[PDB]
Amino acid sequence: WSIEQHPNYYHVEGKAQLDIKNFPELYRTTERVYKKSGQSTKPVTVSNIHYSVLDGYGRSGEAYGIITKDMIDMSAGYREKWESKPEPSGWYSYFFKNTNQRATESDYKHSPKNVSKISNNIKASRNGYLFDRSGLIADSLGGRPFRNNLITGTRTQNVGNNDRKGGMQYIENKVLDHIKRNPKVHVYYKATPVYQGSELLPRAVLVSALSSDGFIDETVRVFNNVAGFNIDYQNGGLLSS
Ligand SMILES: [Cl-]
Ligand SMILES: [Cl-]
Ligand SMILES: [Zn+2]
Ligand SMILES: [Zn+2]
Ligand SMILES: [Zn+2]
Numbered sequence: 001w002s003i004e005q006h007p008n009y010y011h012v013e014g015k016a017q018l019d020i021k022n023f024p025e026l027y028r029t030t031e032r033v034y035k036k037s038g039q040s041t042k043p044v045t046v047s048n049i050h051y052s053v054l055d056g057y058g059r060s061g062e063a064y065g066i067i068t069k070d071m072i073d074m075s076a077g078y079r080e081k082w083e084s085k086p087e088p089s090g091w092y093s094y095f096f097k098n099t100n101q102r103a104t105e106s107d108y109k110h111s112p113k114n115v116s117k118i119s120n121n122i123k124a125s126r127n128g129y130l131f132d133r134s135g136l137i138a139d140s141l142g143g144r145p146f147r148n149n150l151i152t153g154t155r156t157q158n159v160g161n162n163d164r165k166g167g168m169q170y171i172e173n174k175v176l177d178h179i180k181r182n183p184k185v186h187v188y189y190k191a192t193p194v195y196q197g198s199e200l201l202p203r204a205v206l207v208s209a210l211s212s213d214g215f216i217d218e219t220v221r222v223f224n225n226v227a228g229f230n231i232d233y234q235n236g237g238l239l240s241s
């Protein structure tokens with residue numbers, strides 16, 4: 001990643017390059033049957049977003065769906081609480097008490113007595129946390145609030161410089177806005193975390209978006225970076241000086 005080349009924490013890589021055939025199908029149902037809340041019999045056109053199961057390291061994988069104005073509308077009004085323990089891979093470090101040697105999340109689930117769990121997150125300068133629970137499929141687009149729809153992202157991966165035009169927010173808002181201005185239009189949307197080796201944090205998220213009216217047709221690479229810090233992609237957190 002280059003702060004010079006890409007100050008907004010993304011790089012436009014090319015066209016959407018999607019296989020629309022592989023996507024979960026659009027269907028017609030009701031707000032009630034879909035959202036599982038309220039008695040809203042309002043008919044809605046939606047798709048069921050495909051989320052990836054975690055891999056063997058506990059890492060989140062790609063998610064993809066067809067985003068509709070109705071999905072946006074239902075997420076605009078309603079919010080779902082975080083499902084229990086949504087923190088994705090690399091969010092914590094684990095260490096064997098006996099050795100002070102690094103352990104894995106698995107080791108911790110296996111024997112919490114002999115393995116400590118410590119947050120990798122830290123506060124940094126206005127003053128807040130450096131890493132976010134960073135959605136793959138945004139809440140505003142119908143995303144589910146659970147681990148599998150998250151990666152451990154830098155605040156800048158998530159929202160860039162937070163001027164509505166950076167990080168995941170860039171491509172999210174562009175899709176959100178275009179559907180909102182063209183309510184009959186739907187967008188094929190896919191967010192794919194890119195990992196190197198067994199690293200628990202993704203280096204980037206690849207987001208591909210193809211609108212049904214052809215207006216939006218791109219893939220952006222959103223960098224899991226933040227200016228002035230060196231992230232430890234292997235274990236999460238920052239490199240130790
Ligand atoms: Cl595809
Ligand atoms: Cl830098
Ligand atoms: Zn670029
Ligand atoms: Zn599948
Ligand atoms: Zn929602």
Ligand SMILES: [Zn+2]
Pocket residue numbers: 080144145
């Ligand atoms: Zn839910």
Ligand SMILES: [Zn+2]
Pocket residue numbers: 134135138158159168169
């Ligand atoms: Zn986000």
Ligand SMILES: [Zn+2]
Pocket residue numbers: 177178215
């Ligand atoms: Zn547009």
Ligand SMILES: [Zn+2]
Pocket residue numbers: 186212
């Ligand atoms: Zn279509």
Ligand SMILES: [Zn+2]
Pocket residue numbers: 240241
């Ligand atoms: Zn040192």
